[PDB]
Amino acid sequence: KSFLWTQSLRRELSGYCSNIKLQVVKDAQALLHGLDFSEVSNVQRLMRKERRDDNDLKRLRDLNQAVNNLVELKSTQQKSILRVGTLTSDDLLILAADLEKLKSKVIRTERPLSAGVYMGNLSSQQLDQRRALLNMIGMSDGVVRVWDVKNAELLNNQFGTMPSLTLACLTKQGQVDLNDAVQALTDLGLIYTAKYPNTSDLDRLTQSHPILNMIDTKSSLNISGYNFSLGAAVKAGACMLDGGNMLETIKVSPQTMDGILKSILKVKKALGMFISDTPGERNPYENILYKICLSGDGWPYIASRTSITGRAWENTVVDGLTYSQLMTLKDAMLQLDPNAKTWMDIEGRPEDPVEIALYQPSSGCYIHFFREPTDLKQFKQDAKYSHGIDVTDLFATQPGLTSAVIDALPRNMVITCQGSDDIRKLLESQGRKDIKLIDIALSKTDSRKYENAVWDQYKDLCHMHTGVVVEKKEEITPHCALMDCIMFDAAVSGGLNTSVLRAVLPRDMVFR
């Protein structure tokens, strides 16, 4: 039982819990006196949209920043490095392992909302599986995406619930006294000390506490802090309580972060807690671990966190692809349209490639990754005459992607390329003889007509090409497998449009 994990965590983490009612009420009062509740209404309206764009995200960000301005309970940016001490060597191994798993669960739950899942021309079975994933992650051409934004990073930390905001939006939007809302939330917390409240429980509590009618009882996914979900209601009430060992009231500091994680691992081991291999709602451990590693200075469950940058696996670090990374990769490749024109290009010989890219012009999605060379001698000749990569810069990239990606490519996909023989040689070598190739056969001059246009528009998309490259001598622009795909397509189309491209692989995957 998730609730048992929760009660176990409460018992063990009791000493880090605090009475915070006055603080939360105080912040709720600053919202009531300072915030525009018609903008709260407006962000509720945007979150009701099936498809939301950059203008929508900005209205959410600005509102989140107005709230963060008004409240005192906020987490501040704080990177944590965990070293052997209070945490043992083996504790550290457990944590790094579970952080890796949590990252896959979280990416697979949340990234599709922005990256998208192709839902067009596919088999009955592919659609059924994709639909299953879409439904489990709260998602309701042919690509389905909720957020169409230019920088998906701006979605980070913008959707947390906070007790002060919940209490203020109940008071103002439900049109009742603060005290009325605080007592109903109290009455609801008292329940949570004993069980996870359900619909039935809500219905009875609403009898005596009509304010609680605002609360939707029927997930925590694809929502915001402005929504009246059961989780946000139950969270706010856990704060209304004199004592109770509520996990929600925990405050973390650099002094207490290791001791709290140590206590969590003690509950984990005792109870067989685990990070799920499956997308969706967080279980109580995935939830605590995520919230704590986001910042070692704040209130993990209840503070304004909308000004925090980075993800939990990035803000806290422990000092082939795994099963976890392969699932994440598999789900990222669902964005691809298997029927669409697809370019592929490589740098390196096919027998020893160090840069690989695939590009789908009509949608703009691309696959771009790297690989450390086997033959160092041949690599240095290639660096000088072709690609200009410093091998030392490839040490930071993730291995095993080449097999994993090519293993994962769509059946009978049709790939277009300039280098046809080297592509075919590479795909044969990774056991993928079934993929049909189109050789485009551009002359050298024609192929590079749009080289400058392409670098001027897309230079930010690759930082790997640092070496001076020459042709027998005179300096030339280095060859980049991604730029090469894009410029070949421009050459074939007889022009290059202004267009945002969409990275299919998470950057967290290309690099380690």
Instruction: Select the residue interacting with a second copy from 81, 89, 123, 272 (CB under 8 A).
Output: 272
CA distance 159 to 149: 16
Instruction: Select the residue interacting with a second copy from 25, 205, 294, 505 (CB under 8 A).
Output: 205
Instruction: Select the residue interacting with Zn ion from 99, 329, 480, 504 (CB under 5 A).
Output: 480
Other CB atoms within a 10 A radius of the CB of residue 481 amount to: 27
- E-only strand ranges, 444-484: 469-471, 474-476
Q: Which is nearer to a second copy, 22 or 500 (CB)?
A: 22
CA 461 to chain centre: 19
Q: In whole angstroms, how close is the CB of 454 to a second copy at the nearest point?
A: 34
Give the length of the chain: 512
Q: With binding defined as CB under 8 A, does residue 194 bind a second copy?
A: yes
CA 450 to chain centre: 34
Query: Is 314 annotated to bind ligand?
Result: no
Return the H-helix or E-strand segment holding 143.
strand 143-144
Instruction: Select the residue interacting with Zn ion from 221, 414, 462, 476 (CB under 5 A).
Output: 462
Instruction: Select the residue interacting with a second copy from 77, 208, 278, 452 (CB under 8 A).
Output: 208
Choose the one of Zn ion, a second copy, Mn ion, none that binds residue 462, judging by a C-beta under 5 to 8 angstroms depending on kind: Zn ion
Q: In whole angstroms, how close is the CB of 251 to Mn ion at the nearest point?
A: 52
Q: With binding defined as CB under 8 A, does residue 201 bind a second copy?
A: yes
Q: With binding defined as CB under 8 A, does residue 468 bind a second copy?
A: no
As given in the structure block, the two tokens for residue 276 are 């799920």
Number of residues that bind Mn ion (CB under 5 A): 3
Q: Are strands 365-370 and 147-148 parallel, antiparallel or unpaired?
A: unpaired
Tell me the Cα Rg of the chain. Answer: 26
Q: With binding defined as CB under 8 A, does residue 392 bind a second copy?
A: no
Query: Is 475 annotated to bind ligand?
Result: no
By CB neighbour count within 10 A (0-12 exposed, 13-18 middle, 19+ buried), where does 443 fall?
A: exposed
Q: Which is nearer to a second copy, 79 or 330 (CB)?
A: 330
With beta carbons less than 8 A apart as the criterion, state whether 232 and 285 touch: no
Q: In whole angstroms, how close is the CB of 391 to Mn ion at the nearest point?
A: 18
DSSP 179-248: HHHHHHHHHHHHHHTTS---HHHHHHHHHH-GGGGG-B----SS--TTS-BHHHHHHHHHTT-SSS--GG
Query: Could you say which residues in the range 290-349 bind Mn ion, by CB under 5 A?
Result: 345
As given in the structure block, the two tokens for residue 178 are 């603060």
Q: With binding defined as CB under 8 A, does residue 187 bind a second copy?
A: yes
Stretch that binds Zn ion, among 3-11, 239-247, 412-420, 464-472 (CB under 5 A): 464-472
Q: With binding defined as CB under 8 A, does residue 242 bind a second copy?
A: yes
Q: In whole angstroms, how close is the CB of 425 to Mn ion at the nearest point?
A: 15
Angle at 380 between CA 504 and CA 407, to 5 degrees: 30
Choose the one of a second copy, Mn ion, Zn ion, none that binds residue 480, judging by a C-beta under 5 to 8 angstroms depending on kind: Zn ion
Choose the one of Zn ion, Mn ion, a second copy, none that binds residue 242, judging by a C-beta under 5 to 8 angstroms depending on kind: a second copy
Q: In whole angstroms, how close is the CB of 445 to Mn ion at the nearest point?
A: 15
Residue with tokens 């939301």: 52
DSSP 305-339: -TT--S-HHHHEEE----HHHHHHHHHHGGGS-TT
Give the dihedral sign, CA 419/420/421/424: positive
Query: Could you say which residues in the range 418-437 bind a second copy, by CB under 8 A?
Result: 429, 431, 433-434
Query: Is 480 annotated to bind ligand?
Result: yes
Q: With binding defined as CB under 5 A, does residue 484 bind Mn ion?
A: yes
Chain residues that interact with a second copy, rule: CB under 8 A? 182-183, 186-187, 189-191, 193-195, 200-201, 204-205, 207-208, 241-244, 272, 274, 323, 351, 376-377, 429, 431, 433-434
Residues belonging to the binding site for Zn(2+) are: 355, 462, 465, 480
Residues that bind Mn ion (CB under 5 A): 345, 479, 484
**Residue stretches of the annotated binding site for Mn(2+):** 345, 347, 484
Residues in contact with Zn ion by CB under 5 A are 462, 464, 480
